[PDB]
Design a binder for these strands. Structure first.
Ligand SMILES: [Mg+2]
Ligand SMILES: [Mg+2]
Ligand SMILES: [Mg+2]
Ligand SMILES: [Mg+2]
Ligand SMILES: [Mg+2]
Ligand SMILES: [Mg+2]
Ligand SMILES: [Mg+2]
Ligand SMILES: [Mg+2]
Ligand SMILES: [Mg+2]
Ligand SMILES: [Mg+2]
Ligand SMILES: [Mg+2]
Ligand SMILES: [Mg+2]
Ligand SMILES: [Mg+2]
Ligand SMILES: [Mg+2]
Ligand SMILES: [Mg+2]
Ligand SMILES: [Mg+2]
Ligand SMILES: [Mg+2]
Ligand SMILES: [Mg+2]
Ligand SMILES: [Mg+2]
Ligand SMILES: [Mg+2]
Ligand SMILES: [Mg+2]
Ligand SMILES: [Mg+2]
Ligand SMILES: [Mg+2]
Ligand SMILES: [Mg+2]
Ligand SMILES: [Mg+2]
Ligand SMILES: [Mg+2]
Ligand SMILES: [Mg+2]
Ligand SMILES: [Mg+2]
Ligand SMILES: [Mg+2]
Ligand SMILES: [Mg+2]
Ligand SMILES: [Zn+2]
Lengths: 208, 99, 104, 88
RNA sequence: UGUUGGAGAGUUUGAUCCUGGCUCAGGGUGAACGCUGGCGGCGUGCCUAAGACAUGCAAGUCGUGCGGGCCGCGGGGUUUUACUCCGUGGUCAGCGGCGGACGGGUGAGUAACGCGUGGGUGACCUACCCGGAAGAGGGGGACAACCCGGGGAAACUCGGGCUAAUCCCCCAUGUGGACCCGCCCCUUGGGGUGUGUCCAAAGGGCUUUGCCCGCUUCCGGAUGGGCCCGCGUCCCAUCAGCUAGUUGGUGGGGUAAUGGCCCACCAAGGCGACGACGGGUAGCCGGUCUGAGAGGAUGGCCGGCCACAGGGGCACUGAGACACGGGCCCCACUCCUACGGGAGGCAGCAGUUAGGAAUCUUCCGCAAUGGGCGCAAGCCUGACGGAGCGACGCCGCUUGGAGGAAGAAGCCCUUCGGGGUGUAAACUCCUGAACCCGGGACGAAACCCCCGACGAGGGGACUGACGGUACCGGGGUAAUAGCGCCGGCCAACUCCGUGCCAGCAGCCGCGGUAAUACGGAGGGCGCGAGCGUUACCCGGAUUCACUGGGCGUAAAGGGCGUGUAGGCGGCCUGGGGCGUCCCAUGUGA
């Protein structure tokens, strides 16, 4: 049970806009709209020049809270990375962005990640045919990520794809709104991702 | 109790006295076969050798000595004698002594 | 293959027996400096041919007692008290360390 | 007796054996002599038996006695079909 | 044993710098304690009393080796009688073959060729299995069972008599082999050869002129193992000298084989500062943890090796034992005892009790993999395959998802306008773990039987513990959260209480009436079925420094010299080529 509870206070703590709700966090109400100061009884007071540790920290809780993963699943992937050939940095993201519960977000099947986490749980998604209710499942290059046949008829899902009619997809994905299907072309490269992050810092945090 | 594995310790004994006796014999026949040669009685010591010698390979046939326990005995005795018969003897029967 | 070692006799006191000194040489497990250590092996002289300070070679063989498991192949220089004198001179020292108390 | 038997390596409910050659004496899970292949009873991956006819035969000619089970498997490979024709 | 690798801070001062110890942040744990605790997968779970253990179970198997006792069904011979012959099912024990030397436990002991690594055996053994040669002739005997009697409180023991076989023994036979001795080729007991001597054996079973099983000797393969050697293996020199079978030698004993392994005699040596001897500690390794690496720490699970099975000694039988569930004696211990004498050993699975901060079910299965015995059917097998208990660890899973006001209530703060918890809840809609229905398997194919030739191959049939479990299909409800911290290192701040008190504390310290450092509240950071704590290992610690430190005054130059072992060594050429470097290869499971 990772977090689950108030979100926008997270958005307000990192000081940057986080899309942890899909809709709304777009219309005048993600709080960061006329109230970008942190939560608590001192969110409005003045902030003191952060410690090298504070920055590295804040920057992590960001990268992570965007995907809503336990610091646990978070870490272990970091390691996976560290070990793989390539720039620790992006290699990290690549994987992070390879999570089914996530891919289901990018492909649009759901308004945002958390919801996608769920859809995966309740078995409304499929990979190569055999459904998968596992959020942390790593999508490999060449795997169709379709909607559960018995789910293609749910209002919520139809609603989602209905509005995708037009929304382009990451050049590392592609979908077939008709057959409500969509492939994972290839691991998205750091550029391809527009994250308000500085993974050169997350990295630095786990170097302590 | 009563694992009926005491049968093994029941056979053994029957085999203890079994072995014990053939060997003991071999020994006796061996030594006795010596004494003679030592003294000089030509034949009488070879004649006994054969028997002695035999007993060996006989106790050896089974599992009293087996292996090369039937190779020291033999060779060893076939020396003490021959050699103890190095006080002017001339193996007349030269039985167990390829001369 | 049976190992051959080359050393220097150092005692012919026993019968059909010779005490040979094998100096070996190796770098440190943790300091790489080169180093010398030595071992006394007890080999057999069935001919009493090898005498004090002769530099011999040695081979593994049928144990022939507690400690002796080597032999004396053949010579390598029939004379060198130069080194025997070292060993003999090392011992001579012990004879004088601790106890005796030259102070009493 | 050097015998060709199976050895357990997989984990709990996913057993994976080995056509090892050994002493009935050791435990069919300890040191061995060589490996003649494997077999996964479960039958998931297209590759099951992997018995190396070659070596198999050789241990057999030496006296390695295969279990009833070790046999069935070597028989599926061909550790037993000695070339014939013109007549069958 | 991998190839992207290395963050520091606090603290001795009025202030500074250096030194230098203490301290923290990290990671790991067969863990324990606290608070809390929803599911699953795999893993793992006495680390202390190698203390003591009740009961059950952990090695047996073969009637195609053999003969009987017993309960039973059936068939003969003496026309009805006692008697007796045959077949046969079950059964019990015995004689005998093979297994009990594997598998399973523990780590006490051991600093040792115990282990690791690599070699040696012209110094060796190896049941069963496999290939190849040759053979299986004749004869004789016993001990059990069973029958009689005797001793015993038992445990159990003794004497008396009969009988069988693949049990024992003698003779014959010998492809051969063993030994002595002569010789040859090798070269420490390798191989070949000569006359002499010595040595084999059993039968059982059926579809009976056929074949299955078995048996004897011998050479080879196979595997396993003994022995030996180089090298490598902690701490203390306030342990410095140890040693008499101890060092060697010859003869002999013993063993499968070398050997002081054992004995007799002769010689007197062997080991030691390149640490003998002694004390302490410790099973060793593949590997594990940590670390930038070098290194350090460790060796529980799995695997290989060793050692032990109440303490100690010893041998019998066997290919193998000096034999965990075998045997003999002594010791201690509990137990039966008519006290004369006997009985046991969980460091096997499971449980008990003691100890302890602490460690589980007296389970199910023999379906599978494996081992044992058997022609086979099959028997056995807490080995193993599994299930249970423990958040003990790791990995996945949930407590919901979108929407939802310049913003409820409440609680907090608020030089009192308002800020905060907070879109958090309410409320709406969507999805739907649990739970219910029906379906439910992989792990299982052969051994057997039939055709075939008893091959090859083909045909047939039985076969589950886990399970009615996992998993699939349908219906389906929003349906556990906690815990640590928020002075500095270390991310998180106000108020109220308390007043050097009560109390915090890892270091520095905080509290004596404004405390961001005590306690509660609100809030906040962290992590989440977990979080804190304690203990111990590595890290930080270049704080033992090989990589990587030091000694004028900070800890550190021996008061000086002489000189031993040792370490180190100018210039030129040539041999070796030990070190050193390189290539190949074997080993490095
Ligand atoms: Mg979560
Ligand atoms: Mg944070
Ligand atoms: Mg989402
Ligand atoms: Mg018994
Ligand atoms: Mg007996
Ligand atoms: Mg002999
Ligand atoms: Mg040296
Ligand atoms: Mg010696
Ligand atoms: Mg095994
Ligand atoms: Mg590598
Ligand atoms: Mg001060
Ligand atoms: Mg009989
Ligand atoms: Mg009766
Ligand atoms: Mg009649
Ligand atoms: Mg019975
Ligand atoms: Mg019986
Ligand atoms: Mg064992
Ligand atoms: Mg070795
Ligand atoms: Mg001659
Ligand atoms: Mg020899
Ligand atoms: Mg370091
Ligand atoms: Mg026991
Ligand atoms: Mg079986
Ligand atoms: Mg059978
Ligand atoms: Mg582990
Ligand atoms: Mg519904
Ligand atoms: Mg260090
Ligand atoms: Mg220093
Ligand atoms: Mg020079
Ligand atoms: Mg060289
Ligand atoms: Zn937001």
């Amino acid at each position: 049970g990772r977090y689950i509870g108030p979100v926008c206070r997270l958005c307000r703590r990192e000081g940057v806009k986080l899309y942890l709700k899909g809709e709304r966090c777009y219309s005048p109400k993600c709080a960061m709209e006329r109230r970008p100061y942190p939560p608590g009884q001192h969110g409005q007071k003045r902030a003191r020049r952060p410690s090298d540790y504070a920055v590295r920290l804040r920057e992590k809780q960001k990268l992570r809270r965007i995907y809503g993963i336990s610091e646990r699943q978070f870490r272990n992937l970091f390691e996976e990375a560290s070990k793989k050939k390539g720039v620790t940095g992006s290699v990290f993201l690549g994987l992070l962005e390879s999570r089914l519960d996530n891919v289901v977000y990018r492909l649009g099947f759901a308004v945002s990640r958390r919801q996608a986490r769920q859809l995966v749980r309740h078995g409304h998604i499929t990979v190569n045919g055999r459904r998968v209710d596992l959020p942390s499942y790593r999508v490999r290059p060449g795997d169709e990520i379709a909607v559960a046949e018995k789910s293609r008829n749910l209002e919520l899902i139809r609603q989602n794809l209905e509005a995708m009619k037009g929304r382009k997809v990451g050049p590392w994905l592609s979908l077939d709104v008709e057959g409500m299907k969509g492939k994972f072309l290839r691991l998205p490269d750091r550029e391809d991702l527009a994250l308000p992050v500085n993974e050169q810092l997350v990295i630095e945090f786990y170097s302590r | 109790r009563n694992l009926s594995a005491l049968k093994r310790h029941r056979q053994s004994l029957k085999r203890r006295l079994r072995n014990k006796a053939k060997k003991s014999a071999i020994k006796t026949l061996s030594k006795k076969a010596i004494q003679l040669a030592q003294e000089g009685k030509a034949e009488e010591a070879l004649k006994i050798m054969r028997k002695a010698e035999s007993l060996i390979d006989k106790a050896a046939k089974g599992s009293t000595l087996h292996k090369n326990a039937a190779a020291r005995r033999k060779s060893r005795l076939m020396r003490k004698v021959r050699q103890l018969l190095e006080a002017a003897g001339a193996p007349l029967i030269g039985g167990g002594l390829s001369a | 293959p049976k190992k051959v070692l080359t050393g220097v006799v150092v005692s012919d006191k026993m019968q059909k027996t010779v005490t040979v000194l094998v100096e070996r040489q190796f770098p440190h497990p943790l300091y790489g400096k080169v180093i010398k250590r030595s071992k006394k092996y007890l080999a057999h002289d069935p001919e009493e041919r090898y005498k004090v300070g002769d530099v011999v070679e040695i081979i593994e063989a049928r144990p022939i007692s507690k400690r002796k498991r080597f032999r004396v192949l053949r010579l390598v220089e029939e004379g060198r008290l130069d080194l025997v004198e070292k060993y003999l001179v090392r011992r001579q020292n012990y004879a004088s360390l601790s106890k005796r108390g030259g102070k009493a | 007796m050097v015998k060709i038997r199976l050895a357990r390596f997989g984990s709990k409910h996913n057993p994976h054996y080995r056509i090892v050659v050994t002493d009935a004496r050791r435990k069919r899970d300890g040191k061995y002599i060589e490996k003649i292949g494997y077999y996964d009873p479960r039958k998931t991956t297209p590759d099951w038996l992997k018995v190396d006819v070659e070596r198999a035969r050789y241990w057999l000619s030496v006296g390695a006695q295969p279990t009833d089970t070790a046999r069935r498997l070597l028989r599926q490979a061909g550790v037993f079909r000695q070339e014939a024709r013109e007549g069958a």
